[PDB]
């Protein structure tokens, strides 16, 4: 069970760790988060009390190094850093733990929510979507634009999600215009699964990462990517049975976790109505259709 110590908390802030969150007061003696489950990616995230604009945070995996948070009064944010001295880090953590200045990652034993949201998400895939190769952790915020949003302006600060565009030469074989537009199976299976992602696990990893960036940061481009990857599967007549079954589980946990009050901005009416009620896969998402109908019947 790993630890992310905080040097201090000089500004009042709501701190997120995965699906959990804690309010910290200005100069409250808060020195970090312990008992973080090994084996998953995690996200630590921030929203300042004095400017709720820019939710921002860090994707990390404690297997990949010793990470800590320190406030930078010049750039005005909580920064993740790596401590390369193992013994210094162990000694910082042991002291803060002894003084019980750390919150405990509050996982209920029965609760598989975080595993279910991050099942296919891998740090090495995150670091290719979020390019900053000198760090082992990845910064995301509310305002970062996607490569696709930029095409339609600082490339170093972009989310490099895989570009999906239903009206592109990539999506449409010359001579199969109607077939490929109405049945996206060749775009899903040859171009995206065989071609770019190599397998369904990498495709689902990106889908899950996009959702979590949409939910935790209100990142609009991430929400666009999440919906496009759902629509590409639901709009394909030919999808492996294991992928449809896995998609239903993925979406079920995403809809289960979404704050009830954010359904208006994070869910696209057209995509969900098309996916659940008109698409090839209208009958393949039983769990997702039942949670959507019971939790968000207005949207439908």
């Amino acid at each position: 069970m790993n630890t992310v110590p905080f040097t201090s908390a000089p500004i009042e802030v709501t701190i997120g760790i995965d699906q959990y969150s804690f309010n910290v007061k200005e100069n409250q003696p808060f020195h970090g988060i312990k008992d973080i489950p090994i084996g998953h990616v995690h996200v630590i995230h921030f929203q300042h009390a004095d400017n709720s604009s820019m939710r921002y945070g860090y994707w990390f995996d404690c297997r990949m190094g010793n990470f800590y948070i320190q406030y930078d009064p010049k750039d005005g944010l909580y920064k993740m850093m790596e401590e390369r001295d193992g013994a210094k880090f162990e000694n910082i953590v042991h002291n803060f733990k002894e003084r019980q200045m750390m919150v405990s990652y509050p996982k209920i034993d029965e609760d598989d929510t975080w595993y279910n949201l991050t099942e296919f998400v891998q740090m090495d895939k995150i670091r290719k979507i979020v390019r900053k190769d000198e760090n082992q952790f990845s910064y995301v915020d509310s305002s970062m634009t996607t490569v696709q949003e930029n095409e339609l302006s600082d490339p170093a600060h972009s989310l490099n999600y895989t570009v999906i565009n239903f009206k592109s030469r990539e999506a449409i074989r010359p001579g199969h215009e109607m077939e490929d537009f109405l049945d996206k199976s060749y775009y899903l299976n040859t171009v995206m699964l065989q071609g770019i992602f190599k397998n369904s696990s990498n495709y689902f990893g990106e889908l899950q990462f996009a959702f979590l960036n949409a939910m935790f940061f209100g990142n609009y481009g991430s929400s666009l990517q999440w919906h496009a990857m759902i629509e590409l599967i639901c709009s394909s007549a030919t999808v492996p049975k294991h992928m449809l079954d896995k998609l239903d589980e993925i979406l079920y946990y995403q809809i289960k976790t979404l704050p009830e009050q954010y359904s208006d901005i994070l869910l696209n009416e057209r995509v969900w109505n098309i996916c659940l009620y008109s698409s090839f896969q209208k009958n393949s998402l039983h769990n997702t259709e039942k949670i959507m109908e019971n939790k968000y019947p207005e949207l439908l």
């Binding site: 009206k167 592109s168 030469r169 449409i172 010359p174 215009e177 109607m178 537009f181």
Partner: protein
């Protein structure tokens, strides 16, 4: 964006453009079967592709053989339209290719956009105008070449005959839309107005009669009266 009353003069500028109307592509008669069920029989159709500036009409005849063994024909008809318009553009020299294609029905936008991906600089636009191009099959010589076709065929016409020798494109388009609007509202009465004087004939190489400038004023008035006479019936006003 959408072509409307506001940007109407754009039709007659020097940027090559085409209107595409798919109304008459998939045509059927509905009938009873022996068992008392209903069935359709397809008849020959056409794509109506028109340069509004020059009057050049690209009439692509759609032979009933293209529907044989196909499903969801009203959907397919849109894609076949977009396939044939794309083929026509690729067949034209670069300097003759349109800069814009305006579709009369919004359902043509995605099919035509997807068929024209190779032409990203050709703008595909809808229109707010209610154009009467469905009535093209009320023009006897167009109807005749469509019905007689035994295979897919492209036939080239000038829908303005020689009018541009005497009038502007704007005025020629207004005359064409008024004639087609009359033929659409009351075909019998419109054709009666166009042929009532036996002395005025249609040249072999023309679609419409050889009216003098003064006779066109009388004809256009008789067409406007027909449209109002008809409207004061539809609505009882």
């Amino acid at each position: 964006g959408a072509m409307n009353s506001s940007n109407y003069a754009e039709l007659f500028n020097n940027d090559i453009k085409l209107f595409v109307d798919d109304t008459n592509v998939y045509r059927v008669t509905v009938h009873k079967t022996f068992e008392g069920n209903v069935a359709t029989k397809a008849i020959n159709g056409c794509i109506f592709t028109l340069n509004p500036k020059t009057g050049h009409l690209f009439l692509k005849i759609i032979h009933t053989s293209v529907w044989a063994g196909q499903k969801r024909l009203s959907q397919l008809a849109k894609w076949k339209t977009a396939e044939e318009v794309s083929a026509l553009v690729r067949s034209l020299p670069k300097e003759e290719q349109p800069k814009q294609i305006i579709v009369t029905r919004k359902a043509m936008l995605d099919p035509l956009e997807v068929h024209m991906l190779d032409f990203p600089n050709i703008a595909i636009r809808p229109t707010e105008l209610r154009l009467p191009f469905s009535a093209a099959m009320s023009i006897d010589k167009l109807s005749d070449v469509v019905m007689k076709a035994t295979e897919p065929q492209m036939v080239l016409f000038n829908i303005y005959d020689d009018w541009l020798d005497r009038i502007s494109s704007y005025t020629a388009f207004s005359r064409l839309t008024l004639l087609l609007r009359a033929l659409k509202t009351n075909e019998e009465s419109a054709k009666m107005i166009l042929l009532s004087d036996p002395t005025i004939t249609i040249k072999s190489y023309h679609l419409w009669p050889s009216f003098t400038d003064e006779q066109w004023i009388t004809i256009e008035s008789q067409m406007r009266d027909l449209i109002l006479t008809e409207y004061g019936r539809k609505y009882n006003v």
